[PDB]
């Protein structure tokens, strides 16, 4: 299977309430394995998946040093970005960063990502060439010119093609029993009359990993996109995810509807009907 690793940074100012909070979490695919929070009583990098606990004390101190220094750097960055937009010192603002590498089914680098956002809009992104930037606006051009001056993309590139891929592979090996195990959805179809002439069919997928999944309703073999109610894929809390799709159908037409399920956990798609 293909795999990826991502770190997610959130730096949040809060004037009148101390210095900005810095939080970092690490993921391998849909599995978090590490966290750091500057707001912690004793801020340090903490395991969040059993397979990362075997990393030695020097691993944890290395992470912790990286994150503490980032905490300070993102506080300067928030200062700067407030200036770039001529904003007042009254408001709270947020920088977000998500970065990482993607591996193909061969363990080979597919590509890297390094994107940042300010108050929830794209701010600056590293292009897929890992060599040039995309600024969303004249404020982010300031950042771009400053990163070009200091050859920042070269640093990002060395990391994304090198250490990122190396540690991802090491994590995938160490947590192979789970990281490289796809658990198929457990499925079923429910039926609930809404009136004398209509009824709800709900298609359920439970206990799957990873989160990525396709759930669709067809009527006489045709896609029922606009007529399907479809909840966001949701975590169960045991590493697995859940989802459902629902359609209101004319009573007596139920067998004309099929639920289709695609997931890495099963060899061929499932086709399901309500079974009374």
């Amino acid at each position: 299977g293909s795999h990826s690793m991502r770190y997610f940074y959130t730096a949040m100012s809060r004037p009148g309430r101390g210095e900005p909070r810095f939080i970092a979490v690490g993921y391998v695919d849909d599995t978090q394995f590490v966290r750091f929070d500057s707001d912690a009583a004793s801020p340090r990098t903490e395991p969040r998946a059993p397979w990362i606990e075997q990393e030695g004390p020097e691993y944890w101190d290395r992470n912790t040093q990286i994150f503490k220094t980032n905490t300070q750097t993102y506080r300067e960055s928030l200062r700067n970005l407030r200036g770039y937009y001529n904003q007042s010192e009254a408001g709270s603002h947020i920088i977000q960063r998500m970065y990482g590498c993607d591996l193909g089914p061969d363990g080979r680098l597919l590509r890297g990502h390094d994107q940042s956002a300010y108050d929830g809009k794209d701010y600056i992104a590293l292009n897929e060439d890992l060599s040039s930037w995309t600024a969303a606006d004249t404020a982010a051009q300031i950042t771009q010119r400053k990163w070009e001056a200091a050859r920042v993309a070269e640093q990002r590139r060395a990391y994304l093609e090198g250490l990122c891929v190396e540690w991802l592979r090491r994590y995938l090996e160490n947590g192979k029993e789970t990281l490289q195990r796809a658990d198929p959805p457990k499925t079923h179809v429910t039926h609930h009359p809404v009136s004398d002439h209509e009824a709800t069919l709900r298609c359920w997928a439970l206990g799957f990993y990873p989160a990525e999944i396709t759930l669709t309703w067809q009527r006489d073999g045709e896609d029922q996109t606009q007529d399907t109610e479809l909840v966001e894929t949701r975590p169960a809390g045991d590493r697995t995810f859940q989802k459902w799709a629902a359609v209101v159908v004319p009573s007596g037409e139920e067998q004309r509807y099929t639920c289709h399920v695609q997931h890495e956990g099963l060899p061929k798609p499932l086709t399901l009907r309500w079974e009374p």
Binding site: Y7, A24, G26, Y59, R62, N63, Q65, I66, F67, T69, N70, T73, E76, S77, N80, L81, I95, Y99, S116, Y123, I124, T143, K146, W147, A150, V152, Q155, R156, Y159, L163, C164, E166, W167
Partner: peptide, 13 residues
Amino acid sequence: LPEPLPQGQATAY
């Protein structure tokens, strides 16, 4: 492993 800090100055935004 996150991106390490560089040789010199971690460049702010």
